[model samples]
Target chain A: RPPLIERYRNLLPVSEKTPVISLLEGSTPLIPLKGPEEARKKGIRLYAKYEGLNPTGSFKDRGMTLAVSKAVEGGAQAVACASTGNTAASAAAYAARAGILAIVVLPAGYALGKVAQSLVHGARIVQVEGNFDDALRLTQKLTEAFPVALVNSVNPHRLEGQKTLAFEVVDELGDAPHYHALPVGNAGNITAHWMGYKAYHALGKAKRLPRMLGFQAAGAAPLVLGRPVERPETLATAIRIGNPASWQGAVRAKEESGGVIEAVTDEEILFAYRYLAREEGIFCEPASAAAMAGVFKLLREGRLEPESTVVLTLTGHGLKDPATAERVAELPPPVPARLEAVAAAAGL
Target chain B: RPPLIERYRNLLPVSEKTPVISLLEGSTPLIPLKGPEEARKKGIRLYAKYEGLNPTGSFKDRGMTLAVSKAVEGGAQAVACASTGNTAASAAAYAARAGILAIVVLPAGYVALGKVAQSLVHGARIVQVEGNFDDALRLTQKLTEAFPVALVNSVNPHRLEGQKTLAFEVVDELGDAPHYHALPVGNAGNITAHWMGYKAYHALGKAKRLPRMLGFQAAGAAPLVLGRPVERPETLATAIRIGNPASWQGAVRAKEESGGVIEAVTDEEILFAYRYLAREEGIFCEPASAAAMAGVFKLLREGRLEPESTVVLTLTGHGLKDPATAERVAELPPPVPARLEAVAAAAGLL
Candidate 1:
C-alpha cells in the first residue's frame, strides 16, 4: 500500500515562516450520486467531491489563502492576479483579512456579473482592452515593475498550495482511485494533482496513484495540439485560455501517468454542470463541471473501465458566476411591491 | 447573587430532527460593547447580544426552528404564517427541511424583502386584500380554518419552546440583570417570549424570578393605547402587526412578574433605530428597532433604569431595509435604471 504524506513540509505548503495549515480546506466530503437511480442501473458509481465546503465559499480560496497569507507574512503590502472568476473573489476577501493590497486585472469584454464580484469585494480591478491572457501579461509586468506580488498559479506558490486537493481525495478514499478527472486550466491544477498523488502514494496510504485524466476546453486545446491555438472560445470563460501557463506540467503528468488530456466541447460541459445541479443538488461552475463531462467522454470511448473506482474534482462554487446558471434556470420577473403580487410570486 | 437560569431544555433536542437550527441562535454570544476609556467615567458596562449570527441569517430562526419541529411531530404536513419579513424566510427554510409546505400571508402593500426569502425556500404565500393589518387578519383567518397547515407564530404551542431569549440572557449573565430589559414588536410576540422565559426560570429553579418587561412599538405601529390596544395600523413594521397576539398569558406575565406593560412609540423611535445602526455597531430594521430604543428611552427618562445594571433588547433584522441609510452612504443613480437623472427620484424615499 502507498503511504500518507506529512501535512506541511514534504507536501511543501508554500510559506514564508510556515503557513496556515488548514484542516478547513481540502479533504472534502465524497458522496455517492446514483444519477437518479434509474440512470444508475446503466452505469458505475458516480462519486463527487463536495469542494464548495472549502474555506472561502469557493476552492480558489484554498490556493489564494495560502499564497496571500505567505505574501502578507513576508511583509508584502499587496498581491495581485488576473482570474476567470473565483480567484479574484478569494484574493480580495483573503487580502482584506491579510491587510494586503489586492489589484485584480480583468479583460473589459467579459460579462458584467463576473466583474461585479471583485468590485463588491472592493478589489481595485484594472480592466484591460485585451482578453484574459492580456490581463495576465499586464499583471505579470506590474509585478516585476512594482512591489506587488503575483498570486496566480503561474506564480508556482499557488500551484504548490493547491496540491492539497489530491491529499484530500486520497485520505478520504483510503487509497487511490483507478481513475481521476479534473478540469485543466493553466494546467497547474493537473500538476498539483500529480504531485499530491505521488506524495500520497509515496507515503503508503494508497496502493498506487490514480491515472490522471486531465481535460481541456475544446476551444483551448493547445495542450493536445502541442502548440497555442489562438481562438479559445468557450462558455466556460475561466478555462478559455489558448495558452495554459503550466502546459509542460500537464504534458509531464499525462506522459508519466500513461494518461490522456483530452478536449471537451462547451455543450458537454454545460450538460454536466446542469446534471450536477439537477441530479445531485451539488451546483458547480461550468469549468468544474468539465471534469464530469470529460469522464463521460472517456466512458463513452470505452477507454475507462466500467467498474473501476473514480473521483471527479469539482473546482469552484456555483455562486461565483451565477449568470451561467441563471441563464439555464428561469428567473421570473421581479415580484411586485403589492402583497397580492408577493403571494402570487410565492406560488400560493 | 441570584442563580443563573438554563434556557436549554434537555427534554428534546431538535438538532437531529431538523437540519436548520442556527448553531448561533437562541444562545447568542453576549459581547461586552466596551465604551471608550474616557466613557468609563460614566461607570456603566454595556453588553450587546449579537443574534445576527442565526441561520437563514437572522434571529427569527431561534423561534421558527422549534415551532416547525414541534408542529411536524404533531402531524403537520405544512406550516403557515402571516409575516412582515424575516419570519416568513425562517419558517420557509425550516419547512423545506421537514419536507412540508410553508404558506405565509402578508399585507396588501409590500412587506419588503420578506416575500423574496419565502419564494427562495419555495413557501406558499398569500397576500391580504387590503392596505392594512385588518386585511392580514381577514385573510389569515380563512387560511387557518380551511387548511390543516400549522400556523407558526408565538401563538403556536412550540413557540414558547424556543422563545426563551430572556432565559438565555440570564444564562449568559449567570443571573438576572441588576436593572431591566426590553424588546420591540408590533403584535407583542417577543414581549410574550421574554415573559414565558422568566416565569419558566423561576419554576425550573434557574433564577429567583424575572426582570421588568418593557415592550414598545413604532407610534405608527402601537396598537396598545392603555395596557390593551384597539386597532392595528399599516405601520412601517411589516413583521409585527398581529392585531391580536395569542400569547396573552405571556404578555400578562410581564406585568405580574416585574411591573410594566406594553407601551406606544413615537416618530423619535424611528430615528433611534437608525442611530443605533450607524453609531452602535448594531443593525436591524428601523421599525422593530424603534420599538427597542423607544423602551430604552422611556426607562432612562422616567428614571426607571439605574444605569449600573444591564438593559438588553433584541435588534431584530438587518438594517439593509432602511432606505435613508443607503442615501446617507452611496450616491444615487437617476430615477430610472437608465439615464433619467433625477435627484428628486431619491426624494420619494421610503
Candidate 2:
C-alpha cells in the first residue's frame, strides 16, 4: 500500500522534498510475444517492454525524467542530448516539463519525423556537420561551453536511473531473466542495465543477474571485433557507431554476466525487423530490432537453450524511422477521405 | 480495490465481455491547469485530458481500439476511418494490432505528421483527396455500398459506446461538474456527449440529469455557424459535421440540460487560450482554443457570478494539428538526437 514510491525508497536518493511529477508514465507494460510461433516452438521467452508507452514515446523518458529532475535540482537551466532519435525527443519533453532550455544535436541523417517531434516540443536543435562521432564531439565540447546539462548516458544520472529497467523486469517476473538483450550503440544502455541488475541483486530483490548480451551492428561491432573498428557500417543509422563511448561497460557487462557480445548483420536485422512487424506485431526501429536478430542468431547456431526466458528491450517507436521499413512492407499509400481516391489507394 | 478496468466498467452501456485486442493504448492522463484562476473567476473548473498520450498520440484511440476490436470480431478483413487527423493514426495502429487491413481518408488541409504516422505503421492505404465535403460523402457512400468492413464512428455499435467524454468528466471530478460545461464543436460533440451524460445520470447514477453544455465555436467556424441555418452548407470539409448527425439525439441534450449555446470570435476565443497559455498556465493551442475563448467571452461580458463552478473543455490537441504554432510557443523545442537544419524542416517543412 506504500505505492511504488515506498518499495524502492532505498534506491531513490531523492529527499521527500524532491519534486516528482506523478503522471506515472513510466511503469511501462512488459508484453510477452505470443504470436512468434517459430520462436515459441523453439521455446524462446521473447518479451518486450511496450516502451512506446513512455511519457514522450520512448524508453529514454525513463532515464531522462530522472536525470532531468536531478539536473533541475542542481540548478541547471538547460539540458542537451546528442542523438538521432529518442534521447533528443525525451530530453526536449522533460526540459519542457521542467521549464528549462533544451539543446539537441543530431546527424543530418536523423529521420525527418523524428526531428519533427523534437521541434514540436520546441527544442533548440543544431544539425551538426559530420557523422554521429562529430556530433558527440561537439556535444562534449558544448558541455563546458554551456549552462545546459548533458542528457546523454555519458551523464551518470541517466545510467543510474535507466538501470531501473533491469530492476523493473525482476520486479515483474520475480527473478532475473536468464538472458537480457537490447540494441547497443552508445552501449551505455548495456552498462546501465548491468549496473541496474547488480543493484537490484544487492538489494536482495533478485538472487542473480542475467547475461547482458550487448548487441551491435556487424559493421559497428567494436566490442566484439576488439580494439574499436573505425570502418563501421549498418542500415541501423541509430546504432551505426564507429566507436562506442560506453565500450568498457559493455565489455565488462558481457564478461561479468557470463554473456557474450555480438553483432547482427544488417540483412539479418532487416529480416528480423520485418518479421517483428509481420509476425510479432511489434513495430519499432531497426536498431531496436537487432535484439531479436541477435536472439535468432543464437537460436539458429544451436547457441541458445530452449528453456531460457529471454527479455529483449525495444527502444524507439516505428514512426521514428518509417521510410526504412517502407521498402519491406507491402503497404499502399493512404487513401483519400474521398471515394475515388480511397478506392484507388486501396486498389478497389 | 478493483483494477482500473473494473472501476471504469460502467463507461459503456455494453458489457465488459466485449472482446478486446489491446493496441497497448487508452487511459490518457488528466492534468489540472495550474491557473484555473480565469476559470475559477468565472466559477469554472479547468482541466484537460492529455489524450495525446495515446500511442498513435490522440484521443481517437478510445474509440478506435474498441471499434477495431468489434470490427475484427465481425470477421472483417479490413477496418477504415474517415479521419480529421488523430483518428487516422489510431485506426492505423489498431489495424496493425489485430492483423487486419486499415484504410483511412483524410482531407489534405492540415494533417501534418499524422499522415506519416498512418503510412509508417503500414496500417492502411491513406487517401488524401483535394475535394472536401464531396470527398467524405463519396467515400462513405462507396464504402457502405462495397467495402466489407465496419465504419469506426458513433453510428457503429452506438458511437457513445466508444466515446463517453461526458462520462469521463463525471468520474474525474468525483461527481458531476459545475452547473455548466463548455466544449468546442465543429460537428457538435455537445449534441452526442450531453445525451450520453444524461443517460448515465438518469438510468445510471445521481449526477443530476446532466450539466448545461455550453458548446462553442469560432465565429468563422462554418459547421457551428452555418450548421443549423443550412438546408445544405457550401463546404463539408470541416471534421465535425452533423448534417443530421448519427448522434443528433445527444446534441439536443445540451439545450435540455439547461446550458446555453454560443459562439466566440475566432481571434478572441482562440487567441485567449493561446495567450492564456503563455500568460497563465503555459499551454499553447490553435483556433480550436476558440472553445475556451467562447466560454471566456460569456463570462467576461456577462460577469460570471463569482464562485460558480463551471468546467471549460479545451477541444482537441494543444495546437497538435498545427505544428507551426510551436514557432510561437513560449519555450523552444526539446533536445533533439539529430541535426538542427533538418529539425527546422521537420517543423516548418521549408
Candidate 3:
C-alpha cells in the first residue's frame, strides 16, 4: 500500500505533527477494460480507475485518511462533516480509527444504507431541518463555534489528500492516460486530479498531461450549462449539487487541459451502470458510472481521438446502494428440482 | 498483487491454459484491534483478518478467483453453483469477468444481500429451485455433468488452492502461525484450506510451527455437535446454515491433526460480538463472521487462550449484507441543529 502523505511529503503540506493516521489507503487498481482485439475494433483502449475498492468503499478514503489525521494532530477532540453518502462513511470510519468523535450533519430523509454505515462507525448523526446545502452551512458554523474540526471538502487539506489519486494513477500506468474522465459533484475531485497531474508532470514523473473530462447529471449540470443551477435535480443523489464549491477550480481544470465539461441524462447514467457491471464485471454505484457515460459521450462527440488511452474513474461500489441495483435488476423464476428442468431453465 | 496462483503456482495445479481471472483479490489487510492497555491486561495481541474487503465482500472470492479461472482453462462456457449467499456472488462475479455465463441455483425463499449482489453485478441466471440448498446442489451437479458447464461449489479442487493463501498471509505477518487461528465453519472448506496452508508452510521450512485451528458453527445448525445432518437448521447466520457439509473428512482431519475442536456457538453470543466489533473496533461484518469472535470469547472464558500468545479471527463479509442487524442494533437519535451545547450534550461533551 502507498504511504500517501509521507511518500509525497515534500509535495503535500506535510507538517511534522500531522499524525499520519492511515487505514492503509491508496494503491487502488487501474484495470484494463478491453482486450487488444476489442480495442482495435472500438478504436480506443478503456480502463477503469476502480476507486470503490478503497477501505471505505469510496474514493473519499484518500481525503478522509489525511483529513482525520490532521484533525487529531491539531488537538481536536472531534471532527465533523455534512454528508449522508460516501463522505459520511469515510469520515466516520477514520474518526473511529483515531478514537475521536465523528459528528455528521446529514439532511433529513437519508437512506438506511447511508445512515447505517455512519452509525455503525459510531458517528453521532445530527439531522438538519433544511436542505443539504443548509446542513453543509450548519456543519461549517458548528465546527467554527465548537472545538470540532470541519472535514468537508471545503477544507484545503481534503483536496490535498484527494489529489494523491491522480498521482497513484500516473504511477501505476507509468504516465497519465490520453484522457481522464470522472463524475463531477462538488467538483473538488476534478480540481484535485488536475493539481496532481500538473505536479507529477513538473516532477518528470509523467511525460505529458491528460485532458480532464468531467461529467454532470443533465438535471444537475451547472458547470456544463455555464451557469449555477438553483434547483439541481437528478436520480444520482451524489452529484446533485445546485452550486458547486470548487466551481472556479473545475472550470480551470477543463480550460487548462483543453477539455470540456459535459452532461448526461439519468437514462444514460443507468445504462452505463448496468453495462459496466454486466459486461465488464465491474460493479459500481450509478453516480460512479457517470464517468463511464461521460467517456462514451465524449467519443461520440468526436472530442476524443480513436485508439486513445482513456481512464474512467468509478467513484464508489454498487454495494453502497443495493436499492438502485435491485431497481434495474431482474429476478428470474425458480426452476424445478429435477436436473432436466434446471438445465433447460439455464438454456443448456 | 500476488497473482495468487502464479505466486503459489509451484504448489497449485496451474498450467498455461488456465485463464488468469482476477480482481486483484487477496492481500487483504490484517487490522490490529484494541489499545496497548487492553492487550497488556489480556496478555494477548489481537488482529482481525478482514476478509470482507475482498472483491465480492467475502472470503469466497479468494477461492472463486482460481475456481472460475480453472474452469475457463478447461474450455467451459458457463459455471454453476448452488448457493444463496457469498458463494453465489463470488462465483457469478468471476464468471462475468471471464466473459462467460454464470448460472446460480438457489433454494426458494432465499432473499439476502448476497443474492442481490450476484444479480446486480454478474446478471447471472438465477435458478431458484423448489427445494432447499441440498436439492439445488444435487440438481447443479447433475446438470453440469449432463451439460458442458462446470460446478464451482466447495467441491472444486482449485478453490482450496486459492483459499490456502489466507494462512500464508497470516504466517508472513506473524513470522509463524499464531497460537491459534479462528474461522467460521460453513461448508468446512475454509477450515480445511487454512490447515493445508499451515502444514505446507511448515513442510516447506517457511515457518517453525502451525496454529491450532478453531472452527465455530452455529448451535442452531450444528452438524458436528449433533454428529448428523440437521433436518431443520435454524440460525440467523444464514451463511453457516449447512445441514451436511461437503468437507466433513477434511474438517475432522484438521481437528485431529492440529489438536483443535469443532464447536458450536449460540446465536446470542454471535449477535453480541457482531455489535461489539462495530461499536468498539470499527468493524462491521455478517453474522457468520461473528462466530469467530464468539468462539474466541468462549476460549478466553475457559482459559484455553492464554497470555503471551497471539490470536487472529477472520471476519467473513461486510455488515452491508445484513442491514437488519444494524437497524436492530441501534436507531438514529433525534436530530440536533448547530447549537454547541446541544451537540455537546448529545456527544457526551458535558
Candidate 4:
C-alpha cells in the first residue's frame, strides 16, 4: 500500500507537489481483543487500533509524515520540535528520510532512553538551560526567524495527518463503531479523530457518528476538571501535560459528540497495561492503557450498551517504555541446574 | 492482510484442527532505501525487509506463532526454550496468547540491560541456572522430556514452517526480486526456510526465478565459514553469538543450492554498517542484522554484485532491542542558553 498521504490524498491537505516522505507509516493492525472477561460476557466487542506498530513505535509518525513532507515542499531546510518523547523521535526520522535537518530542542538532563531515537537518526539535539516551556518558546522563535518548520502539537498539518488513522479504522470496520476511545495527551489526537469521523460522516463514508470517549491520567486530568492543570503528575509520561495545546478542540469533540472525558488513575492504567499484555497478548505503553481502563470502568458501571462495538486507540508500543516493563516484572529466583528443580519451578 | 497461516493456509502444514494463534505477525514493510550512494551509482536498488516491525520487535515472532500454536494443538501445557534474547521473547508472547506456559531457561548472570523485559511482561517462567548455556539447554531438554512442555528452539520444524512466509511476502511484493536476497545467519533456520519458500513458489509458478541467498555470520561466530565450531564465540552482536548452529546442514544446503557464498564479517564492519544504516538510510537495526548490510557492502565494493540488480536485505530486528549500542555511539553536547539564537546556532539553523 501507498503512504497514508497518497492513500488518502483527496482527504488530506497535500497538493500535487507535496513530497511523500514516509517510513511506511499508518495501516497499523486493528486487532480484535480476546477478553477482559466482563466485556466479553456482556456481548460487547472491543478492538485495539494498535498504532504502536507505526515506524517510530508511536502515533506521532502519522502527523510527522505530513509535517516533514510539507516542510520539505515549502523549501524548508530544517524541521524543529520541542519534544523529549515520541514527537522528537518521529520528527527526526522523517527529517532524516527527507534528507533534511531535524532540530530537537529539549530541557537539560532529559533521559537518554527518551531521546535515543532522535540521537540515532542524527537529529541536532539542542539542550536549553530553562524548562520545557522555554524550550518550546525557543523552538517557535527559531522557526519564525530561520528556515525551520515547527512540528509541535500546535502544527495544523499534524492533525490533518493524524485524522487519517480514523479513516483507516472506518475503511477496515466498514463504518464507525459505537464508541471511539483514546488517551488524551496534547489532546490533538482526540480532536483529529473527531474531525475524521465528522468528515467521513458528512461525506457518506460512515453510516453513523460514534460517541468519542476521551481518557486522561488522573493527576493530569485537566479537561476532566474543566481547567488547566498547574503541576500535572503521572507515571504515564506521554500524557503528563499540564496545559494541552488543543484544549478547545478536545472540548469541542467531547461536547459535540455527546461523549464524556474522564480520568483513570495510574494504578488503573498499569492494571490495564499488564492485563492487555498477559491476557490478550497485546503490549502497549502505559499511556495507551488509559483508554482500556476507561472502557473497563464504563463496563463495570453498566454505561455501555450491550452488543456495542468499541474501538480503543492504543497509541504506542510497550517496547517504547522498557523501563516500566522492567520495573513491573517480577523475575524468578535462579533454580538449580537439574531437570527436577526446573520442572518444579516451572509448575509442570 | 490476514495472518501468515490464514494467508498461506494451503501452503503451510497446518491442518483443520490446528489453532490459529497470531499477533498479526508478518506483513512487515519492504521499505525502499534512499541510498548508500555506492548502490545508487551502480543503479542497484536496495529494499530493507524490516522484520523489526514484528509484534515482539523481531522476526522470531513469525515462527513463534506456529510453534506455540502447534504445541497447544499437540496437547502440550507449556513451551520450552533455552534463549536469552529474541527467541525467549517470542515464545513467551505466543504462549501467553495461546493461554499456555512458556519456560525460558538461561545461564545465570546473563540477564542484563532489560533484555528479558518482553518475556517477563508476557508472563514467561524464566529459569536461570548456575551453569553455562549448554547446561541450560540440556536442562530445558530434560524438562521438556520429563513434562508435557514442547521445545521451541530453532531445531523445531514448526519454526521453519512459519518463517518461510517472509520469502513468500518478498515474492508477493517484488516478484522474487530476481537478483539477490541477503540476511544474517545464526542458527541458519531462516535461510533454510527462505529457500523452502522460494522453491515452493517456483514449483507453483508464482515466481519465475529464485534469487541467490547471501548469508553472513559474525567473524567471532564464523562456524559456517570456518567449517568448525568455536567453543568460545565472542561478539558484540550477541544475537548471533552461537558457536554450534542447530541447522548447520540447512545453511550449507541453501548456500550450495542458490550458488551463494556464506562468509564472515568482522565486528568493526558490522558496527560500521549498523551506524551507516541509521545515519544514512534512517533505518535503525541490531548489530547482527547489520552483518547483512556489511556483507552486501563488501560485495558491492568488490563488484561481485551485478550492477542494476535489485537486492533485498532482511533486517531481522530493531536497534531498540539493544539500547546500549545507541548509548555507546554518541554523547549529548553541552547545554546552551534558553535563547532562540543559542538554540538556532547550536542546531546549525542560523
Candidate 5:
C-alpha cells in the first residue's frame, strides 16, 4: 500500500512545489517465477517483477505519473506523448486524473485494446500514418510549436520515476540480484534501472550492483544491431521501434555494468509468452516476454551460471494486447452434448 | 503484502491440503467516492470498495481462488462454472494457477471482452450453451455427475468464505461496519457472504455490530423484486442479468438478520451512474457496478438512508469487460492540425 513517489521521494526528483499525482502506482509484486525442476537444478533462481498489475497495466505508468505531475506543476494546459501502446494508455489515464488535456499520437495499426484505454479516458488521439520514429518526430514538433509538455522518456523526470522499479527489486530481495533482465525498446528503461542500482549501492542500500541484461526484438534492435534500422518490423507492437532516443544511455549502461544487449526473434518471444502463461500462470504481453526470452538465451550460452539470482521485469500485461493472446492460445474445437465428449476434450 | 487467505485463514475453512491458488487477489482499495458537497451536507459518507483492480479484474477472483483451491484438494481433475462473465474469468484464471482443467459453460449471448480474458490468459475450454443462465447451470450440474469436474458456483462454501473478507476489509478500515453496504446483486452470494463476515466479527467480539445490506438488481431482471423467477431475464448489466439464483436462501438470511432491503434500479439510472464514475472518480467499471451508486441516489431521494452514517458501495469488474458500451456513449472530436492555435481553440483554457 506504499505510494510509489512518496515512498521513494528522497531518491526521486520531487518537492513541496511539485504537484504529485498518483493512481497508487508502483510497489508491484516481486513474485518468484517457479521454473521447471531441471531448470532449477541447473542453478537458476528466477523472479519476475510483474509491472502489469499497475493501475494502467504497464511499467509506463510509473514514469507517466511523475511526468504528468511535473507538467501540471509547470502550469501546462495539456500533456503530449508519442507512444507505441503502453505509453499512450499510461499518458492518457494520468492526464485525465490530473484534470488536463492529453494529446496522444500513435503510429497507425496499433492494438485496439491498448488504444481503447486512451479513448475511454477521453484523450485526444491523433494517428499518424507513419512508424514510431515518425510519430516521435511529429510529437517533438508539436510540443515545440505549442505550449504542451512532452512526456516521452527523453524527459529526465520520466527515467527518474522509472528508476524506482530497481529500488523495489532490491528492497524486496534484501539486496541486488546477480543479474537483471528487461525488454529494451527506447533503451530508457535499461539506463534508468542502471541509474537506480548505482544510486542505491552508493547510498549503501544494495549489497551489490546487478549486471543489466537487456533484450530487443530482432527486427527492431537498434541497440543490439549497433545502428538505427530504417524501418523496424516486429509482431511485438510495443517494442517495434527502429531508432531509440536513449541509444547512448543504453550503451553506457551496457559498458558500465558489464552487461550485454542482445536481440531475440519474434518466435522466441512468443514461445516465452506462452510458456510463462501456461507453465507459471504468468500472462504478459509479447514485449514483456522478451526479457524471459533473453534469460533463456543467456542460459543456453552458459553466460548465466547455476544458482545465480536473476530477475526478469515484465513490462506490460497480456490484456493490453488480447488479440495476440487469443491468436496464440490454442483452443480445442467445440464439444458435443455428452459428458464423455466434455471429458475427452479436457485431455488431462 | 500479506496474502488474502493467509491474513484471514482463521475466518476461512482451509488446511495444509488446500491448493491455495492465488493471483494475489484481495486487499482491494476502499476509495472514498468524491460526490457533491451537498451529499456531504446530507450526512452521507460514501466510499467505494473498488474491486475492479483484482488480478482478473473483478471481485469474483477473491471467491474463485478459494473455490478452485478446495476443488484441487478434493482430487478434482477440472473445475466447472456456469458464469455470466466475471465468474468464468475468475474461475478459469484460478483453475489455471491450480494446474487443473477449466471448463467454462456460458450462456450463448455473453460479452466478448469479458469472456476473452478467460479464454486467452487462463486457457479455459469455453462451451457456449444454446440456453439461458439457468440452463447453463443445469447442464454444468449434469456434466459434474459423470466427470471428476467440481462445480465452482455458489454451491461451493469456500467461495462464500473468500467473499467475507470484503466485509472484514471495511471493518479493518472503519473500525466497525458502516451503517449500510450497497452492492449489485446477481446470485446474491456476495450479499450473504458480506453479512456472514460482519456477523462473525460481532460474534467473536472483533467488531461491535453488523451493517444493513442494500442489494440492487436491474429492473428488467429483478428476481428479488418480483419474489419469483422471470423466464428470460434481460439487462445491460450483463453480469447480474440472471433470473434464478442458486444462493437465494443465503440472501434472505442476510436481509432478515440485518434489517436490510432489496430494490431494483432502471437501466437509465445505471447508465447515468456509470458515466459519473468515469468522468468524476476516474474509475472505469462494468455497468453492473453502477447499480450500487444508483441505489444510493434512490435512497437519498426517498429520505430512507440516514443523514449521519457511513455507506460503502462495491464496484465490481473493470471497464475492459465492456469497452464497446463506453465507446458508443461518446466519441472524440476529429483530429485537428498539429498547430497550437488550432488546438487552443478546442480547449477551455482562457
Candidate 6:
C-alpha cells in the first residue's frame, strides 16, 4: 500500500511542494477480533484498527509524516517537541528521514529508557529542569524564536494527517461503523477522528459518521470531570495527562457526534490489555486498552445495541512498554534438567 | 489483505478442518531504502523486507502461525519450544490465540531481561532448567514425545509452510528483483525457507528468476561458514547466537544451489550497520538483522555485486527487541537549565 498522504491525497492538505517525508506510515491493519462471549453472542462484531503496527509503533507516525513533511516544505531546519514517548519517537524518525534536526525537550528526571527510540533516531535531546508543562512551554518559545517547527499535539497539521485514519476505515468498511472508540490522551486523536468521520460524511464517501467513544484513565479523567486534573496518576502512563491541549475540540467531538467521553480504572485497562493479547492475538499498550475497557463496560451495562459494529483504535504496540508486561507476568521457578521434571512443571 | 494462510490458501498445507489461528501476521512492507552514496551512484536499488513489522515483532510469527495451527489440528493439547527469543514470543502468541498451552524451555542463567515479556504476557509456561541449548532442545523433544504436545522450533516442518509466503510476497510485489536476497542466518530455517519460496515461485512461473541467496552469520556463532558447530557461541545478537543450526544442510543446499555465499561478520561490523540503518535510514532493526547489511556492505566495498543490481535485506526483528544494544550505541547528554534560550542553544536552533 502507498503512504497515507499518497493514498488520501485528495483529502489531505498537501500539494506538489510538500516533500513526502514518510516511513510508510499508516495503512495499519483493521484486524477482526474474536470478542468476548457476550458481545459475540449478541452478534456484535469488533474490529481493532491496529495502529500499533505503524512504523514507530504508534498512531503518532501518521501525524509525524505530514508534520515533518510540511516543516521541510516550509524550509524549517529543525522540528521540536516536548515529549518523552511516542511523539518524540515519531518526530525524531520523520525528521531523520527528512535529513533535518529533531530536537526533543523533556522534563527533568524522565527515564532514558522511555526515549530510546528518540535517542536511536539521532534526535537532539534537551532535558529541562522543570515539569512537563514547562518543557512544553519552552518548546513553544524555542520554535517561535528559531526555525525549529513545533510538532506537538497543538500542531494543526498533526490532526489533519491523523484524520486520514477515518478515511481509511470508511474506505475499508464501505461506510462508518456504528461507533468508533479510542483512548483519549491529549484529546488530539479523538478530535482528529471526528474530523475525519465528518469530512468523509460531507464528501459522501461514508454514508454516516460514527459516534466517537473516547476513553481516559480514571485518575486522569479531566474530560469526565470537566476540568483539568493536576497531579494525575495512572499506570497507563501514555494517558496520564493533567491537562489536555485540545480540550475544546474534544468537547466539540463529543457534543456534535453524541458520543461519550468516559473514564476507566487502571485495573479495567490492564484486564482489557491482557485479554486482547491472550484471547485475540493482539498485543497493544495499556493506554490503548482503555477503549476496549470502555466498550466492555457498555456491553455489560446493556447500553450498546445488538448486531452493531464497533471499532477500537489500538493506539500503540505493547512491545513499546516492556515494563508493564514484566510487572504483570508471573515467572515460574527453574526446574531440573530432566525431561520428567520439565514435563511435570509444564503441567502436562 | 487477509492472513497468510487465507491469502495463499491454495499453496499452504491447510484444510477446512485446520483451524485458522492468525494475528494477521504476513504482508509486511517492502520499504525502499535511500542507499548510501556509492551504492546510489552505481544505481544499486536497496529494499528492506522489514519482518520487524510482524505481529510479534519478528519473522518467527510467519512460522508460528502455521506451527500452532497444525498442532491444534493434530489434537495437540500444548505446543513446546526451546527458544530464548523471537521463537518463544511467536509460539506463545500463536498458542494463546489457539487457546492452547505454550511451554518454553530455556537454559538456566540465560534468560535475558525483557526477552520473555511477550511469552509471559501471553500466559506461556516458561521452564528454566540447568542445561545448555542442546540439553533444553533434547528435554523439549522428550516432553513433546511423552505428552500430547507439538514442537514449534525450526526443526518443525510446518514452520516453513508459512515462512515461504514471504518469498511469494516479494515476487507478487516486485516481480522478482533478479539480483540478490540477503538475511541473517540463525538456525538457517529462514534462508532455507526463502530459497524454497523462490524456487516454488519460479516453478509456478510467478517469478521469472530467483535471486542469489546471501546469508550472513555472526562470526562467533557461524556454524555454516566454519563447517562445524562452535560451542559457547558469543555474540551480542542473542537471537542469532546459535551454536548448532538445525537446518544446516538446508542452508548449505540454498547457498550451493543459488550460487551464494555464507559469510561471517564480526560484532563490530554488525554494530556499525545497526547504527547506520537507524541513524541514516530511520529503520531501527535488531543487531542480527544488521549482519545482512554488514555482509552487503562488505560485498559492495569489494565490488562483488554488479552495477544496477537490486538487493533486498530481510530485517528479522525490531530494535525494541534489544534495548541493551540501543543503550550501548549512545548515551543521554547532561541536562541544561529549563530556559528557552538554554533549550535553543542546546538544540543548536540559535
**DockQ values per model:** 0.07, 0.24, 0.51, 0.69, 0.33, 0.68
Instruction: Write down the worst ten-residue block by lDDT for model 1 chain A.
Output: A1-10
Interface RMSD of each: 13.0, 8.9, 2.6, 1.6, 3.7, 1.8
| Span of 10 residues, lowest total lDDT, candidate 5 chain A | A330-339
Backbone clash pairs for candidate 1 read A2-A204, A2-A205, A2-A206, A3-A203, A3-A204, A3-A205, A4-A203, A78-A101, B84-B238
Candidate 5 local lDDT, B155-214, one digit each (tens): 578889999888888888888889999999888898889899899888877778778999
Error of 1 at B317 (Å): 13
**Chain A: TM-score in each model:** 0.85, 0.87, 0.94, 0.98, 0.94, 0.97
Q: What residue runs in model 6 are displaced by over 4 Å at the alpha carbon?
A: A336-341, B130-135, B329-331
User: Is candidate 1 or 2 superior in DockQ?
Assistant: 2
Clashing pairs in 6: none
Ranking by TM-score: 4, 6, 3, 5, 2, 1
- For candidate 6, write residues B1-350 as lDDT tens digits: 46788898888889999898888888888888898666898899888888888888999899899999899999999999877678888988888889998999888878864778888888888998988867888898888888999999897888987898888998888876458999999999999999988998898998988899999999999989899998889898878898899899999999999899999999999998998888888888899999999988988888988899999899999888887888754556678889988888888876
lDDT of 3 by residue, B193-259 (tens): 9999899989988879888889999999989767888878889998888888889889989988998
Please give the lDDT score for candidate 2: 0.61
Model 2 error, position B253 (Å) = 2.4
Encode model 5's per-residue lDDT on A174-235: one tens digit a residue.
99999999999888898889999999998899998888999999999989888998889888
Model 3 docking category: medium
- lDDT per residue, candidate 6, A1-348, as tens digits? 577888888888899888988888787888888878879989999999988888888999998899999999999998998887899888888888889999988888746678888889899999888987799889888888898899989798999999988988888899999999999999999999999999999899988778889999999999999999987989998899879999999999999988899999999999999999888878889999999999998989887888999999999998888999888887777788998889888878
Per-prediction TM-score to the true structure, in the order listed: 0.58, 0.76, 0.93, 0.98, 0.91, 0.97
The number of the candidate with the highest DockQ is 4
Per-candidate Cα lDDT values, in order, are 0.59, 0.61, 0.80, 0.88, 0.79, 0.88
- Model 4 lDDT at residue A260: 85
Which tens-of-lDDT digit does each residue in B78-105 have in candidate 4? 9999887899888988888899999988
Model 4 agreement with the true structure over A1-348: per-residue lDDT tens digits:
587899989998889999999888888888888877888888999999988888888898999999999999999999988887789888888888899999898887557788888888888999999998899888888999898999988799999899988898999999999999999999999999999998898889889888999999999999999889999999999999989999999999999988989999999999999888887788889999999999998989999988999999999988889989999887788877888788888878
Model 1 misplaced stretches (Cα beyond 4 Å): A1-10, A13-28, A34-39, A106-112, A128-134, A224-227, A298-308, A331-348, B1-350
In candidate 5, position A97 carries an lDDT of: 71
